[PDB]
Every structure is written in C-alpha cells, then in structure tokens.
C-alpha cells in the first residue's frame, strides 16, 4: 500500500 518514495508526495 505504501507508494514508492519518488512518487507524488503532495
């Protein structure tokens, strides 16, 4: 469920 670290964090 956790997104990739480089995904959109906003």
């Amino acid at each position, epitope marked *: 469920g*956790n*997104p990739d*670290p*480089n*995904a*959109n*964090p*906003n």
Partner: antibody
Amino acid sequence: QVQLVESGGGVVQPGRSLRLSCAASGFTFSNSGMHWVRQVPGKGLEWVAIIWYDGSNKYYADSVKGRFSVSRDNSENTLYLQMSNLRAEDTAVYYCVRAYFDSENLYDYYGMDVWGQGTTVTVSS
Amino acid sequence: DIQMTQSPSTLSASVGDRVTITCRASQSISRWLAWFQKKPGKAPKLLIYTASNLESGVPSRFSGSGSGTEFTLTISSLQPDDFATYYCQQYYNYWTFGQGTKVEVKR
C-alpha cells in the same frame, strides 16, 4: 514566496539527541511533501528523509534509519527532525527542502525545488 | 543507489563564455534529473527540472538537455553572478547528488 527557516542546530555530544524544526510560509504546507537534506563537510549533499504531505509515508536514508525520525504538524506549518544516537559523522548543515510542487501533475517521479537557509549541527566532544 | 558523476569538477571561464557541465548516471533515469546552483553560505537554487525544463525564476541563459544517462547544463553567456558550484540530482530512485562543479573566474 516560499519561505523555509530551520532552527534547532547547535553542538551536541556524540551519542545524544537533538530536534530540528522548520517553519514554512508562502505556500500551503499541508499540500506539499517535505525533505531533510544535509551538507556534510568533506562529503557533499546527502538526502536524509522524506515525509508525505499528511505524514502517512516516511522514508529515510539507510545511514540514519533507526536513529532519525521525521514528523510534521500541518496546523503549525512546522517540519520536525528528531535525531538520536548522534555521531561525529552527522556533523553537517541540515536543510529543510520542499518536494517539487507540480500543479499539473505531469511527471511520474518527484524531486525537490525550494531549500531553506539551513541550520548547522556540530556533533563533537 | 544511482551514482551521479559530473565533469569537469572545476572549470575556469571568463565573463561571457559559454560553459557546459556534464552529468552522468550509473543507470538510466530518463529525464528525472535536476540542476542546482549553490554559493558558499547560501541555500541551493533549483535551475533545471525534468532534465531540460527551465524554472520560471531562472534566467534563460541557463539551459539543460539530455535523457537516459547523459545530461548537460549550459550557461550561454556567463554573467558575473553565475560563478558558483553546480550540482545535478537524480530523483528516479531516492535522491542522489553529483559531486558538484565549481565555476571559477579566469583572469
């Protein structure tokens, strides 16, 4: 318009703790991911941690994992970095950095845009 | 991780020269590459994003190009305030910086 001001830096003995803070203004803090990045003397710049806009996701560099913790309070527009078990290798200028904000959500992966002025942490006996 | 190497590490140029800095990645990162300016005692400044898209606040004399593993930063007409250290940063897999390139004045 984006303004970031870090505080908390100073001298800490090896093995002790220290908390850094970062005050944000000029943008909607609760809608932006935030980074911690440091500039180590001798080395270069080094990513430390990222935190999602709502704090639901946190990722850490392997060199600080288990020792550092990143948090935020969107009601106070403040980013925190709790540092524990500090060693002399953590001496650096610590920068609060906003993740790149793209109103159009064009691209698949995200970097950083606005850096703070930085606060200096000196871990030494 | 992904390793970022810049060339040259240092360069001497005059006011008005065209300067090109190259940055190579140990793996393919498409266009997930940014360029930062930095001066001693000052915060870094984002110059180029997505390898070639100039930030709106940055003067048009700064230009970026490249995809995959080879990337270049260009300053068409070096102005007095352009002498600084420049860093490339990949943001494909976590975030790693190049070793920085110092632009010195030639006299």
